[PDB]
Amino acid sequence: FNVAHGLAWSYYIGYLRLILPELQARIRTYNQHYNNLLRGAVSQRLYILLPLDCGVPDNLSMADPNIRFLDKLPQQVYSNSIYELLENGQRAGTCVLEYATPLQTLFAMSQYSQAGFSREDRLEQAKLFCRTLEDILADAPESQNNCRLIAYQEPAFSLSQEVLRHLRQEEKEEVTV
Template sequence: MQSLQDQDDLIPRPRGSLPKMCAAVLSAMTIGGFLFLSPERLFAWVTMVILILTLGPLLHGLCMLAEEILYHSNTRHRGRGWSHVLPACGLWGKTLLAAGLAGLLLQLVRHPLPHQGQSWKLVILASSLYPLLKSLGVLGPSEVEVSALCEGRKMNVAHGLAWSFYIGYLRLVLPRLDDSITAFCATHQTSLGRGSRKLIILIPLNANISHKLNEEDDRILFSDNLPNNEIDRAGVRGRVYKHSVYRAHECVLEYATPC
């Protein structure tokens, strides 16, 4: 049997907020340094950088928008129009709002940046190069970023398998399981236990599932099968779903108590 330490090594923990904390500390240290060196132009520098970092993704979104409108508006977006395509390309929401506010604040700032003309040239050049570098994969997301995105949106393989198990099996058999158990108890002179009923799904860490549970533990004995459930599914008339009843002996348990 695997130890708890081995199980922790097999099952990855959900990713936390440490990258955000590190980014916040790094930004605070950098802004603090500029505040010490040039406090009168700090606000202008910050708005300029925000404008560069948001205008670049917006231009990249325009490049993606051209592809989506010309070739994929019907097949991928089903002709739902600009209200769907624009957010899908990142041309909506926080990025657009941040770019607009940064541009407005940069015009209203009291202490303009030195060499204002060159600063705007830098904005245009950096924003124009961003779509190229992004398209070439230089600024592409790392494997950790892709994994974190899939994990946050519940798009991992494990999530897909779980949904498949629920939609293709549990959603069909669970509504009929209670009646099957009642019918089994009536024919086998077995009484139902008191208290709430719980469904516990056992998933081995090594994905090795035995065909006979008594081969894994001789204290688990096969009793009988529940009555069959026949369900029309995927073009198959009367597909049979069945469950087996086992008797477990020498089960160690303890109720959780406050003290």
């Protein structure tokens, strides 16, 4: 009994597979402007945050003040937000970012006593979710190429620096291959 299996398949089939194809176009269009305006470029991939502690805040800035909402991505109804990543008060990147909502379900199950679902169980299933979703996106037609999973365990950490590491690696890959 592993709720993570079905959560990952549902998150892909009922959301990712539907949004990613429109996403690529929406981002190119936005980038025409963003370029001419802020001489910036928004990454073409959806960045999905996977905190293994299953903590999804109501606003990204609360999880890290260097992640600041910039703009909503326009439609060609799906809502998506562009964020800027700061270093020393200066802009270091911009991207479409959001948390994997299924993890909220895992968190809630660990607080629902009838479930018998411990924090240990929650962490094990959060990792299994990440692994399963990765497998799915690896086999998926083009859709996978439109996003990147960012899974991280916080110690007992700079989320913005983690996102920037991926964004800089993505740019490196783009120009080299």
